[PDB]
Design a protein around this ligand. Structure first.
Ligand code: HEM
Ligand code: HEM
Ligand code: HEM
Ligand code: HEM
Length: 101
């Protein structure tokens, strides 16, 4: 259902139950062959740990930025909230976010 990306020391969570209307492929994208179901931060994938790095190797980049070939966590949440200001706050705000729990 909803996992916590914490191999050792790092809080966060993704509930597969609240995202049932999205195709698995949108997130688990087809790369250099087929759809890979491995963790996003493995060796040879998104392992770069510097936030100024905007290449496809960046970790902070693929989770927070807006201009990308595949929609990011923040990228898709903006379209979903639309004109509801109270809801845009809850899904894209930095302070006290449910994404970092
Ligand atoms: C579609 C119904 C769907 C499938 C299938 C799928 C599978 C899947 C697996 C096997 C894992 C576990 C990997 C592990 O052992 O850590 C997993 C994990 C994550 N998923 Fe997923 N997933 C499906 C759907 C979705 C959707 C639509 C998204 C994006 C909103 C998504 C995202 C992720 C993420 C992030 C993880 C966590 C990986 C981690 O680093 O812990 N999944 N999924
Ligand atoms: C884990 C479910 C996962 C996420 C989340 C994710 C996101 C993601 C984005 C948003 C991009 C766009 C980058 C850009 O600058 O436009 C992107 C691109 C690539 N990814 Fe990825 N990705 C996830 C997982 C994986 C895994 C497991 C690997 C390693 C096999 C991987 C690799 C790549 C590569 C390569 C690209 C670029 C592909 C291209 O068209 O050149 N991703 N990912
Ligand atoms: C990126 C890996 C990512 C994370 C992390 C994430 C988290 C997240 C949370 C915590 C919620 C809030 C649920 C709650 O209130 O308990 C949530 C909800 C929605 N999301 Fe999401 N989400 C991530 C990725 C994505 C992507 C890429 C999309 C779109 C393709 C997406 C969509 C949604 C939708 C829909 C919701 C529901 C909003 C509602 O009206 O309840 N998320 N996400
Ligand atoms: C608001 C734009 C915002 C900020 C700023 C922010 C910061 C932040 C940091 C510094 C990290 C740690 C990076 C590292 O590698 O050490 C981090 C991690 C994650 N975030 Fe975030 N974040 C902000 C907002 C959001 C929102 C609204 C979401 C969900 C839609 C989101 C998601 C994530 C995810 C996933 C991670 C990785 C979690 C992990 O593996 O520990 N952030 N964020």
């Amino acid at each position: 259902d909803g996992l916590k990306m914490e191999a050792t020391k790092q809080p966060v969570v993704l509930n597969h139950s609240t995202h049932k209307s999205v195709k698995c492929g949108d997130c688990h994208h087809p790369v250099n062959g087929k759809e890979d179901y491995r963790k996003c931060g493995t060796a040879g994938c998104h392992d770069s740990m510097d936030k100024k790095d905007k290449s496809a190797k960046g970790y902070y980049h693929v989770m927070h930025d807006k201009n990308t070939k595949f929609k990011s966590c923040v990228g898709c949440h903006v379209e979903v909230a639309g004109a509801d200001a109270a809801k845009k706050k809850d899904l894209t705000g930095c302070k006290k976010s449910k994404c970092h729990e």
